[PDB]
Amino acid sequence: NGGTILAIAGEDFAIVASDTRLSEGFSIHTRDSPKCYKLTDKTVIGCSGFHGDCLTLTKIIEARLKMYKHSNNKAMTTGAIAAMLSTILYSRRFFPYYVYNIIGGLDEEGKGAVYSFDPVGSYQRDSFKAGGSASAMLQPLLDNQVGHVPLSLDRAMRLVKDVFISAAERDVYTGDALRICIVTKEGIRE
């Protein structure tokens, strides 16, 4: 179990795309699952690693961000999630959540956000990251054509798109339908 996540934000878009399928071992069970659950018009979170954990973790994230939204009556910052989620991963670390989560909330400055995680908490603002099973396949290539671009969005959509065509025919845990969730100032753009 696993599966691939990818995210890039330069200019306003935080393109969080991921494959739908989950495999318990090899027995692809539903081909319709999203990994990139939306949380807020801006927050979108990919989660790869272990679905059973991903579910539980995202419900805990949603509950906690709503608690914040009551406690401060101020929207949950993307930067607050980057510092918050790492502590959530540490809270259950001696028995750990086997989950690699990419955060995509829209900033206060109207820019993209990507925050790489590992199972024990390593938040990283970065221009791109792919996590999951095919991440080793995608990082050098995706880094090469993205990392003097003004973050061109149309070519960037094609650049996000094509690498999952390539990962899907190469790694056996990326495939089926691709779901993309751009995060722009107009909102989440599924």
Partner 1 sequence: NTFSPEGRLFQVEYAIEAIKLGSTAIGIQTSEGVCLAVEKRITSPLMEPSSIEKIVEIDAHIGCAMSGLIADAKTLIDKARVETQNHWFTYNETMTVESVTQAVSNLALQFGSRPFGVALLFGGVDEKGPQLFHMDPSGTFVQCDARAIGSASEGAQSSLQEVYHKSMTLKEAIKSSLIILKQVMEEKLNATNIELATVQPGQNFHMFTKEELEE
Partner 2 sequence: PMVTGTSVLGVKFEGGVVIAADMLGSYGSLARFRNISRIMRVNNSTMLGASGDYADFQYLKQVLGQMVIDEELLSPRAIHSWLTRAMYSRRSKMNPLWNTMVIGGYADGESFLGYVDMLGVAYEAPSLATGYGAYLAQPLLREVLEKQPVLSQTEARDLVERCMRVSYNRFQIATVTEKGVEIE
Partner 3 sequence: YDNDVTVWSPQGRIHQIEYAMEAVKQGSATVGLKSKTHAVLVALKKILHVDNHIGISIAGLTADARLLCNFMRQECLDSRFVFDRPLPVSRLVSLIGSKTQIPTQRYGRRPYGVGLLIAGYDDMGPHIFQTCPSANYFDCRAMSIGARSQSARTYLERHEFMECNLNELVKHGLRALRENVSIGIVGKDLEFTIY
**Residues forming the site for partner 3 (CB under 8 A):** 59, 62-63, 66-67, 69-70, 73
Tokens encoding 34: 């999203």
Q: Which residues contribute to the site for partner 2 (CB under 8 A)?
A: 1, 22, 24, 27, 29-30, 32-33, 50-53, 55-56, 95
Which stretches does DSSP call E strand in 25-69? 27-28, 37-38, 44-48
67, interface contact from partner 2, partner 1, partner 3, none, CB < 5-8 Å by kind: partner 3
- State in angstroms the smallest separation of the CB of 176 from partner 2: 13
Q: Which residues contribute to the site for partner 1 (CB under 8 A)?
A: 68, 71-72, 74, 77, 79-80, 82-84, 87
**Nearest residue (CB) to partner 2, 19 versus 53:** 53
**Nearest residue (CB) to partner 1, 91 versus 152:** 91
* Max CA pair span of the chain: 47
Tokens encoding 155: 């070519």
Token look-up 């990392």 returns 147
Residues 6+ apart with CB under 8 A from 127: 8, 9, 10, 114, 146, 147
